[PDB]
Design a protein around this nucleic acid. Structure first.
Ligand SMILES: NC(=[NH2+])NCCC[C@H](NC(=O)[C@@H]1CCCN1C(=O)[C@H](N)Cc1ccccc1)[C@H](O)CCl
Ligand SMILES: [K+]
Lengths: 249, 28
DNA sequence: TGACGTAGGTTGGTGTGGTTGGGGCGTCA
Protein backbone atom coordinates (compact mmCIF):
# COMPACT_ATOMS: atom_id res chain seq x y z
CA UNK A 1 0.00 0.00 0.00
CA UNK A 2 1.56 3.25 -1.25
CA UNK A 3 0.72 6.64 0.31
CA UNK A 4 -1.20 4.91 3.07
CA UNK A 5 -0.50 4.78 6.77
CA UNK A 6 -0.62 2.62 9.89
CA UNK A 7 -3.95 1.09 10.73
CA UNK A 8 -5.61 1.63 14.06
CA UNK A 9 -6.03 -1.45 16.12
CA UNK A 10 -9.17 -3.41 15.42
CA UNK A 11 -9.98 -1.05 12.53
CA UNK A 12 -10.14 -3.92 10.03
CA UNK A 13 -11.06 -7.07 11.97
CA UNK A 14 -11.92 -9.02 8.79
CA UNK A 15 -8.32 -8.64 7.61
CA UNK A 16 -6.77 -12.04 7.02
CA UNK A 17 -3.15 -12.85 6.26
CA UNK A 18 -2.39 -15.51 3.68
CA UNK A 19 0.74 -17.29 4.65
CA UNK A 20 3.03 -19.71 2.95
CA UNK A 21 4.20 -22.53 5.10
CA UNK A 22 7.70 -23.16 3.57
CA UNK A 23 9.51 -20.79 3.16
CA UNK A 24 7.45 -19.18 5.91
CA UNK A 25 6.32 -16.17 4.00
CA UNK A 26 3.41 -13.77 3.81
CA UNK A 27 1.81 -14.24 0.37
CA UNK A 28 -1.35 -12.21 0.21
CA UNK A 29 -4.19 -10.47 1.94
CA UNK A 30 -7.61 -12.05 2.42
CA UNK A 31 -10.95 -11.40 4.14
CA UNK A 32 -13.14 -13.14 6.74
CA UNK A 33 -16.74 -13.43 5.53
CA UNK A 34 -17.96 -15.89 8.17
CA UNK A 35 -16.53 -18.00 11.01
CA UNK A 36 -15.74 -20.83 8.57
CA UNK A 37 -14.93 -19.02 5.29
CA UNK A 38 -12.26 -16.71 3.86
CA UNK A 39 -12.09 -14.76 0.58
CA UNK A 40 -8.85 -14.14 -1.41
CA UNK A 41 -7.65 -13.42 -4.97
CA UNK A 42 -7.31 -16.57 -7.07
CA UNK A 43 -3.87 -15.58 -8.35
CA UNK A 44 -2.53 -15.73 -4.83
CA UNK A 45 -2.97 -19.51 -5.33
CA UNK A 46 -2.92 -20.29 -9.03
CA UNK A 47 -0.68 -18.44 -11.45
CA UNK A 48 1.02 -20.78 -14.00
CA UNK A 49 2.90 -17.91 -15.70
CA UNK A 50 5.01 -17.72 -12.47
CA UNK A 51 4.73 -21.47 -11.80
CA UNK A 52 2.40 -20.90 -8.72
CA UNK A 53 0.01 -23.77 -8.03
CA UNK A 54 -0.35 -23.92 -4.22
CA UNK A 55 -2.70 -26.35 -2.49
CA UNK A 56 -4.28 -26.61 1.00
CA UNK A 57 -1.44 -28.04 3.04
CA UNK A 58 0.94 -25.58 1.42
CA UNK A 59 -0.72 -22.69 3.26
CA UNK A 60 -2.18 -21.39 6.45
CA UNK A 61 -4.25 -18.41 7.30
CA UNK A 62 -3.70 -15.86 10.07
CA UNK A 63 -6.56 -13.85 11.39
CA UNK A 64 -6.73 -10.87 13.74
CA UNK A 65 -3.17 -9.71 13.04
CA UNK A 66 -1.60 -6.26 12.94
CA UNK A 67 2.12 -6.70 13.12
CA UNK A 68 3.32 -7.93 9.75
CA UNK A 69 5.74 -10.43 11.31
CA UNK A 70 5.60 -11.34 15.03
CA UNK A 71 3.25 -13.86 16.60
CA UNK A 72 0.67 -11.61 18.26
CA UNK A 73 -0.17 -14.00 21.07
CA UNK A 74 -3.76 -14.40 22.22
CA UNK A 75 -4.73 -11.91 19.55
CA UNK A 76 -4.18 -13.64 16.26
CA UNK A 77 -5.78 -16.94 15.41
CA UNK A 78 -4.22 -19.30 12.93
CA UNK A 79 -6.15 -21.72 10.75
CA UNK A 80 -5.25 -24.45 8.33
CA UNK A 81 -7.32 -25.06 5.19
CA UNK A 82 -9.84 -27.81 4.47
CA UNK A 83 -10.53 -26.73 0.91
CA UNK A 84 -9.49 -24.21 -1.66
CA UNK A 85 -12.07 -23.12 -4.19
CA UNK A 86 -11.04 -21.24 -7.36
CA UNK A 87 -13.53 -19.70 -9.77
CA UNK A 88 -13.82 -22.13 -12.64
CA UNK A 89 -13.77 -19.29 -15.27
CA UNK A 90 -10.79 -17.66 -13.52
CA UNK A 91 -8.55 -16.28 -16.34
CA UNK A 92 -4.74 -16.39 -15.85
CA UNK A 93 -3.86 -16.58 -19.58
CA UNK A 94 -5.01 -13.02 -20.37
CA UNK A 95 -6.36 -10.61 -17.75
CA UNK A 96 -7.13 -12.15 -14.32
CA UNK A 97 -10.85 -12.20 -15.15
CA UNK A 98 -12.60 -13.44 -12.03
CA UNK A 99 -9.55 -13.40 -9.76
CA UNK A 100 -11.48 -14.81 -6.88
CA UNK A 101 -11.06 -17.71 -4.50
CA UNK A 102 -12.46 -19.20 -1.33
CA UNK A 103 -10.77 -21.12 1.47
CA UNK A 104 -12.77 -23.06 4.05
CA UNK A 105 -11.12 -23.32 7.38
CA UNK A 106 -10.30 -26.61 9.05
CA UNK A 107 -11.81 -25.15 12.21
CA UNK A 108 -14.03 -22.08 12.41
CA UNK A 109 -12.60 -19.16 14.25
CA UNK A 110 -14.01 -17.33 17.27
CA UNK A 111 -14.89 -13.70 16.73
CA UNK A 112 -13.19 -11.19 19.03
CA UNK A 113 -12.41 -7.48 19.15
CA UNK A 114 -9.71 -8.03 16.50
CA UNK A 115 -11.60 -10.71 14.46
CA UNK A 116 -14.95 -10.12 12.83
CA UNK A 117 -16.49 -10.76 9.40
CA UNK A 118 -17.35 -8.27 6.66
CA UNK A 119 -20.69 -7.96 4.89
CA UNK A 120 -21.22 -8.84 1.27
CA UNK A 121 -23.25 -6.45 -0.76
CA UNK A 122 -26.70 -6.76 -2.27
CA UNK A 123 -27.86 -5.75 -5.67
CA UNK A 124 -29.25 -2.78 -3.73
CA UNK A 125 -26.04 -2.05 -1.85
CA UNK A 126 -23.71 -2.53 -4.85
CA UNK A 127 -26.04 -0.55 -7.09
CA UNK A 128 -25.75 2.57 -4.89
CA UNK A 129 -22.12 2.60 -3.59
CA UNK A 130 -20.11 1.15 -6.44
CA UNK A 131 -20.24 4.45 -8.33
CA UNK A 132 -17.37 6.51 -9.64
CA UNK A 133 -15.83 9.16 -7.37
CA UNK A 134 -17.21 7.53 -4.24
CA UNK A 135 -14.39 6.42 -1.92
CA UNK A 136 -13.50 2.99 -0.40
CA UNK A 137 -10.65 1.57 1.67
CA UNK A 138 -7.82 -0.80 0.82
CA UNK A 139 -5.84 -2.46 3.57
CA UNK A 140 -2.81 -4.77 3.44
CA UNK A 141 0.76 -5.66 4.54
CA UNK A 142 2.00 -5.46 0.92
CA UNK A 143 4.89 -3.41 -0.36
CA UNK A 144 5.02 0.34 0.22
CA UNK A 145 6.49 1.22 -3.24
CA UNK A 146 7.45 -0.61 -6.49
CA UNK A 147 11.28 -0.32 -5.96
CA UNK A 148 10.76 -1.60 1.79
CA UNK A 149 7.85 -3.59 3.28
CA UNK A 150 5.87 -2.27 6.41
CA UNK A 151 5.97 -3.47 10.04
CA UNK A 152 2.26 -3.06 10.80
CA UNK A 153 -0.96 -3.16 8.64
CA UNK A 154 -1.49 -0.26 6.14
CA UNK A 155 -4.69 1.56 5.19
CA UNK A 156 -5.51 3.86 2.34
CA UNK A 157 -8.67 5.43 0.94
CA UNK A 158 -9.24 5.66 -2.78
CA UNK A 159 -11.88 7.04 -5.15
CA UNK A 160 -13.50 4.67 -7.62
CA UNK A 161 -12.84 5.52 -11.29
CA UNK A 162 -15.13 5.71 -14.33
CA UNK A 163 -15.18 2.44 -16.28
CA UNK A 164 -14.08 4.21 -19.49
CA UNK A 165 -11.08 5.81 -17.71
CA UNK A 166 -9.85 2.41 -16.49
CA UNK A 167 -10.10 1.11 -20.10
CA UNK A 168 -8.11 4.07 -21.47
CA UNK A 169 -5.49 3.78 -18.65
CA UNK A 170 -4.21 0.36 -19.77
CA UNK A 171 -3.62 -2.19 -22.48
CA UNK A 172 -4.93 -5.27 -20.57
CA UNK A 173 -8.27 -6.56 -21.77
CA UNK A 174 -10.52 -5.09 -18.99
CA UNK A 175 -13.88 -6.80 -18.21
CA UNK A 176 -17.07 -6.17 -16.27
CA UNK A 177 -15.67 -8.31 -13.36
CA UNK A 178 -13.08 -5.61 -12.50
CA UNK A 179 -13.17 -2.03 -11.27
CA UNK A 180 -10.34 0.47 -10.99
CA UNK A 181 -9.70 3.06 -8.34
CA UNK A 182 -7.16 5.68 -7.46
CA UNK A 183 -6.60 9.38 -8.03
CA UNK A 184 -5.76 11.38 -11.19
CA UNK A 185 -2.84 13.74 -11.66
CA UNK A 186 -5.09 16.89 -11.44
CA UNK A 187 -6.40 16.00 -7.99
CA UNK A 188 -3.01 16.23 -6.20
CA UNK A 189 -3.67 13.28 -3.84
CA UNK A 190 -2.00 9.89 -4.09
CA UNK A 191 -2.55 6.30 -3.11
CA UNK A 192 -2.49 2.76 -4.45
CA UNK A 193 -2.07 -0.84 -3.57
CA UNK A 194 0.85 -3.00 -4.45
CA UNK A 195 2.44 -6.40 -4.81
CA UNK A 196 1.59 -8.41 -1.65
CA UNK A 197 -1.80 -6.68 -1.15
CA UNK A 198 -3.62 -9.16 -3.33
CA UNK A 199 -6.61 -10.87 -1.89
CA UNK A 200 -7.23 -8.12 0.62
CA UNK A 201 -10.45 -6.16 0.68
CA UNK A 202 -11.63 -2.92 -0.88
CA UNK A 203 -14.38 -2.07 1.56
CA UNK A 204 -17.04 0.59 1.80
CA UNK A 205 -19.19 1.84 4.71
CA UNK A 206 -22.95 2.06 4.14
CA UNK A 207 -24.36 5.43 5.16
CA UNK A 208 -27.88 3.81 5.38
CA UNK A 209 -27.03 1.11 8.00
CA UNK A 210 -23.50 1.89 9.12
CA UNK A 211 -21.94 -1.48 8.14
CA UNK A 212 -18.80 -2.25 6.16
CA UNK A 213 -19.32 -4.24 2.93
CA UNK A 214 -16.58 -5.77 0.81
CA UNK A 215 -16.96 -4.44 -2.73
CA UNK A 216 -13.58 -5.44 -4.13
CA UNK A 217 -10.66 -7.84 -3.77
CA UNK A 218 -7.20 -6.54 -4.65
CA UNK A 219 -6.42 -8.09 -8.00
CA UNK A 220 -3.90 -6.21 -10.08
CA UNK A 221 -2.15 -3.07 -11.27
CA UNK A 222 0.74 -1.73 -13.35
CA UNK A 223 3.53 -0.74 -10.98
CA UNK A 224 2.33 0.99 -7.81
CA UNK A 225 0.95 4.53 -7.30
CA UNK A 226 1.91 5.27 -10.87
CA UNK A 227 0.71 8.55 -12.40
CA UNK A 228 -2.42 7.96 -14.49
CA UNK A 229 -2.71 4.27 -13.50
CA UNK A 230 -5.33 2.74 -11.30
CA UNK A 231 -5.54 -0.21 -8.99
CA UNK A 232 -7.74 -3.09 -10.07
CA UNK A 233 -10.00 -4.93 -7.71
CA UNK A 234 -12.13 -7.97 -8.56
CA UNK A 235 -15.82 -6.95 -8.68
CA UNK A 236 -17.12 -8.98 -5.71
CA UNK A 237 -20.81 -8.49 -6.14
CA UNK A 238 -20.75 -9.62 -9.82
CA UNK A 239 -19.34 -12.94 -8.53
CA UNK A 240 -21.58 -13.23 -5.46
CA UNK A 241 -23.64 -16.06 -7.05
CA UNK A 242 -20.56 -18.18 -7.46
CA UNK A 243 -19.68 -17.35 -3.86
CA UNK A 244 -23.13 -18.11 -2.63
CA UNK A 245 -23.14 -21.44 -4.51
CA UNK A 246 -19.81 -22.59 -3.17
CA UNK A 247 -20.72 -21.86 0.43
CA UNK A 248 -24.02 -23.75 0.20
CA UNK A 249 -21.92 -26.43 -1.69
CA UNK B 1 -22.82 -12.95 9.31
CA UNK B 2 -25.91 -11.80 11.28
CA UNK B 3 -23.70 -9.17 12.91
CA UNK B 4 -21.42 -8.39 9.94
CA UNK B 5 -19.55 -5.13 9.30
CA UNK B 6 -19.92 -3.75 12.83
CA UNK B 7 -16.41 -3.48 14.25
CA UNK B 8 -16.11 -4.21 18.02
CA UNK B 9 -13.80 -1.26 18.61
CA UNK B 10 -15.68 1.37 16.52
CA UNK B 11 -19.32 0.82 15.52
CA UNK B 12 -20.00 -1.13 18.69
CA UNK B 13 -18.37 1.38 20.99
CA UNK B 14 -19.54 4.28 18.87
CA UNK B 15 -16.19 5.56 17.68
CA UNK B 16 -14.91 6.78 14.37
CA UNK B 17 -11.67 5.46 12.98
CA UNK B 18 -9.66 8.47 11.92
CA UNK B 19 -10.37 8.41 8.17
CA UNK B 20 -13.93 6.99 7.83
CA UNK B 21 -15.44 10.48 7.37
CA UNK B 22 -13.14 10.87 4.41
CA UNK B 23 -15.24 8.08 2.86
CA UNK B 24 -18.75 9.29 3.81
CA UNK B 25 -18.08 12.82 2.65
CA UNK B 26 -17.26 11.38 -0.78
CA UNK B 27 -21.00 10.55 -1.29
CA UNK B 28 -21.74 13.93 -2.99
C1' DT C 1 30.71 -0.84 29.74
C1' DG C 2 27.31 -4.45 30.41
C1' DA C 3 24.32 -7.95 32.12
C1' DC C 4 21.57 -9.38 35.42
C1' DG C 5 16.73 -8.96 37.13
C1' DT C 6 12.85 -7.30 35.89
C1' DA C 7 7.91 -4.66 33.79
C1' DG C 8 2.84 -4.59 29.30
C1' DG C 9 1.42 -4.36 24.93
C1' DT C 10 -3.65 -5.20 20.55
C1' DT C 11 -1.92 -10.62 25.20
C1' DG C 12 0.95 -14.68 29.93
C1' DG C 13 4.27 -15.59 32.53
C1' DT C 14 8.13 -19.55 38.63
C1' DG C 15 8.43 -14.60 31.61
C1' DT C 16 12.31 -11.49 29.09
C1' DG C 17 12.04 -16.73 24.32
C1' DG C 18 8.44 -18.85 22.49
C1' DT C 19 5.75 -20.92 16.25
C1' DT C 20 7.39 -13.50 18.14
C1' DG C 21 10.41 -7.70 19.29
C1' DG C 22 11.93 -5.17 22.44
C1' DG C 23 10.20 -2.68 26.26
C1' DG C 24 12.64 0.90 31.05
C1' DC C 25 15.73 1.22 34.67
C1' DG C 26 18.55 0.69 38.73
C1' DT C 27 21.64 -2.25 40.43
C1' DC C 28 26.28 -4.35 40.11
C1' DA C 29 30.41 -7.45 38.48
N1 LIG D 1 -2.54 -2.11 -7.17
C1 LIG D 1 -1.49 -2.42 -7.96
N2 LIG D 1 -0.83 -1.42 -8.55
N3 LIG D 1 -1.08 -3.70 -8.17
C2 LIG D 1 -1.68 -4.81 -7.46
C3 LIG D 1 -1.00 -6.12 -7.75
C4 LIG D 1 -1.54 -7.19 -6.82
C5 LIG D 1 -0.73 -8.46 -7.08
N4 LIG D 1 -1.15 -8.99 -8.36
C6 LIG D 1 -0.27 -9.13 -9.36
O1 LIG D 1 0.94 -8.93 -9.25
C7 LIG D 1 -0.85 -9.49 -10.70
C8 LIG D 1 -0.91 -11.00 -10.90
C9 LIG D 1 0.01 -11.35 -12.04
C10 LIG D 1 0.71 -10.07 -12.44
N5 LIG D 1 0.00 -8.97 -11.78
C11 LIG D 1 0.06 -7.64 -12.04
O2 LIG D 1 -0.37 -6.80 -11.28
C12 LIG D 1 0.68 -7.18 -13.34
N6 LIG D 1 1.50 -6.01 -13.11
C13 LIG D 1 -0.38 -6.85 -14.38
C14 LIG D 1 -0.94 -8.11 -14.98
C15 LIG D 1 -2.32 -8.31 -14.99
C16 LIG D 1 -2.85 -9.49 -15.54
C17 LIG D 1 -2.01 -10.46 -16.09
C18 LIG D 1 -0.63 -10.26 -16.09
C19 LIG D 1 -0.11 -9.07 -15.55
C20 LIG D 1 -0.92 -9.48 -5.98
O3 LIG D 1 -0.20 -9.24 -4.77
C21 LIG D 1 -0.48 -10.90 -6.31
K1 LIG E 1 6.45 -11.03 25.65
Amino acid sequence: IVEGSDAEIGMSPWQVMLFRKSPQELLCGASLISDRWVLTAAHCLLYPPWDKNFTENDLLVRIGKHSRTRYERNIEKISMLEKIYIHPRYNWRENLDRDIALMKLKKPVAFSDYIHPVCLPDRETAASLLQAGYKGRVTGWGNLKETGQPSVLQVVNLPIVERPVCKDSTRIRITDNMFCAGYKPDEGKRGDACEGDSGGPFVMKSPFNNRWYQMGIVSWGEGCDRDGKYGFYTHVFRLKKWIQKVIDQ
Amino acid sequence: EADCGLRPLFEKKSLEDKTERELLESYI
